[PDB]
Design a protein around this ligand. Structure first.
Ligand SMILES: CCc1sc2ncnc(N[C@H](CO)C(=O)O)c2c1-c1ccccc1
Ligand SMILES: OC[C@H]1O[C@H](O[C@H]2[C@H](O)[C@@H](O)[C@@H](O)O[C@@H]2CO)[C@H](O)[C@@H](O)[C@@H]1O
Ligand code: NA
Length: 512
């Protein structure tokens, strides 16, 4: 296996207290003789699933809890085994954040929420509403200052505004219901794009540009998390931390993250990782080391949270958190963030209109579930000979299914001999063999030009396999088969599918 035994490699994001974490690691090495290496690679949240899937990577990965369902579903995280007495040292709602499919899949460290951070010497009374920002910027611009700069390249930072007047990710979790292009989301993003059109913000502003501007005293406000506070202390800007402005009378709703530590499932060092996490990091002295480097927010460790909760910055953090929501941890969170990131960037730049951007995001976010509904229904009715009587809950699903029935009948008829021969060559007998189908379908499906004819052929093969599985009394393998096909299709063809307008495109192409 790629990972080395008898040491710990930790990955953590570069905005967090990695030097303090390394200090904890030195203490661990002094007591145990085991060397701890902390790294902060770029795009670690994308890198981790690529390397961990091959049995490589770090022993411990730190990130907000939202990405970890995905990791867990993919087999990349060890289940953790804190005993009762350890469990009781952290807040139950922090453990709830790192529960997937009933199992604990990470240790919670700290609760993060975005707040409004403001320069008390420029703006002694910060605005309660978004709507008053344009006027305030006009006033500040007369003195060579701006009202507000924040990172527009990561949707995390814009989401509180998008969500304020009723935007939402997944309904509280009903995965069918995405609220990315409803009228509330549209309103929020239109307000953001108007700020930009009226020269109150610049589309190119990123994390670094906003942080420098605030920390040099050029802009009166930023939006950021507790990790930013250290660098402002150093700058000698006199700052406060407050509740985010309202929009159309409603609170900004930040997406709340629980910084968490997961154990790589390929690690031969799981017991050392546990010892590090429970007996060195999640203690008063351990969290203090990290916190002194870059503040964590409101920590999951009750003993130390009682001291931090007296800080008015932490109170503000908790106030904003209470108005927002805990992020979901479902495997499609990754696709939701990619889709919303693109939408914000394209709306802010003018590359798409607000309505066009958010339509594309809504299609990207729901792609996996929508594809699965269609493909699973088709596979099961082909296998059994009868359709599923439940409603879709679904206009696109229903028409796409109708289309697939019409087109797929022809394909399965014409390809029957070839499909017979391919199935005989692959010998799919049970759930273990459906696992092996993925590698073959990626190769055969991907190494080929993409068009809807080829997608129908893939799904038609699926249906033909489903009928065989039913005949051999393996009907319980049909759902996993459908999941596997949907996985190959959407992992490899996502961008083409979105550009083709998803399943509405399919329906239009074969209309005919
Ligand atoms: C794993 C079996 C699969 S998956 C798939 N996906 C798209 N096209 C296919 N075939 C068409 C026409 O055969 C193509 O390559 O354009 C296939 C075949 C498949 C099934 C039987 C024989 C050859 C390929
Ligand atoms: O922008 C989408 C992004 O948001 C969250 O990432 C936060 C992270 O939680 C914080 O710890 C801080 O580091 O800033 C990040 C924003 O750049 C999600 O946790 C993440 O999965 C998502 O891609
Ligand atoms: Na990053």
């Amino acid at each position: 296996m790629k990972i080395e035994e008898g040491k710990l490699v930790i990955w953590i994001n570069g905005d967090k207290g990695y030097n303090g974490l390394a200090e904890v690691g030195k203490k661990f090495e002094k007591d145990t003789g085991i060397k701890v290496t902390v790294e902060h690679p770029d795009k670690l949240e994308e890198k981790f699933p690529q390397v961990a899937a091959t049995g490589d990577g770090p022993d411990i990965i730190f990130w907000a809890h939202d990405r970890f369902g995905g990791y867990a579903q993919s087999g990349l995280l060890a289940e953790i085994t804190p005993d009762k007495a350890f469990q009781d040292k952290l807040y139950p709602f922090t453990w709830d954040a790192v529960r997937y499919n009933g199992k604990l899949i990470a240790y919670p460290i700290a609760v993060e929420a975005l707040s409004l951070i403001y320069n008390k010497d420029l703006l002694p009374n910060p605005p309660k509403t978004w709507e008053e920002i344009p006027a305030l910027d006009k006033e500040l611009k007369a003195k060579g200052k701006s009202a507000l700069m924040f990172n527009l390249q990561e949707p995390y930072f814009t989401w509180p505004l998008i969500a304020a007047d009723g935007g939402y990710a997944f309904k509280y979790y009903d995965i069918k219901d995405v609220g990315v292009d409803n009228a509330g989301a549209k309103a929020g993003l239109t307000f953001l794009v108007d700020l930009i059109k009226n020269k109150h913000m610049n589309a190119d502003t990123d994390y670094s540009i906003a942080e420098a501007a605030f920390n040099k005293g050029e802009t009166a406000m930023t939006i950021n998390g507790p990790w930013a506070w250290s660098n402002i202390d150093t700058s000698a800007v006199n700052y406060g931390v407050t509740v985010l402005p309202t929009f159309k009378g409603q609170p900004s709703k930040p997406f709340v993250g629980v910084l968490s530590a997961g154990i790589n499932a390929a690690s031969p060092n799981k017991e050392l990782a546990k010892e590090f996490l429970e007996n060195y990091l999640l203690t008063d002295e351990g969290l203090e080391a990290v916190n002194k480097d870059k503040p964590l927010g409101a920590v999951a460790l009750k003993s130390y949270e009682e001291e931090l909760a007296k800080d008015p910055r932490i109170a503000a953090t908790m106030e904003n958190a209470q108005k927002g929501e805990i992020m979901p941890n479902i495997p499609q969170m990754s696709a939701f963030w990619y889709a919303v990131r693109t939408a914000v960037i394209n709306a802010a730049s003018g590359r798409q209109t607000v309505d066009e951007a958010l339509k594309d995001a809504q299609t990207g976010s729901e792609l996996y579930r929508q594809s699965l509904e269609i493909i699973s229904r088709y596979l099961r009715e082909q296998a059994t000979g009868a359709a599923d009587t439940a409603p879709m809950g679904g206009a696109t699903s229903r028409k796409a299914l109708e289309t697939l029935r019409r087109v797929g009948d022809g394909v399965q008829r014409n390809h029957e001999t070839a499909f017979q021969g391919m199935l005989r060559k692959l010998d799919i007998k049970n759930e273990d063999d459906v696992k092996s189908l993925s590698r073959v379908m990626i190769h055969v499906f991907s190494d080929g030009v993409t068009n809807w004819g080829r997608i129908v052929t893939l799904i038609s093969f699926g249906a033909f396999v489903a009928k065989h599985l039913k005949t051999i009394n393996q009907e319980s393998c049909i759902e996993p088969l459908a999941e596997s096909i949907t996985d190959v299709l959407v992992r490899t063809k996502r961008d083409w599918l979105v550009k083709q307008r998803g399943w509405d495109g399919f329906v239009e192409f074969f209309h005919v």
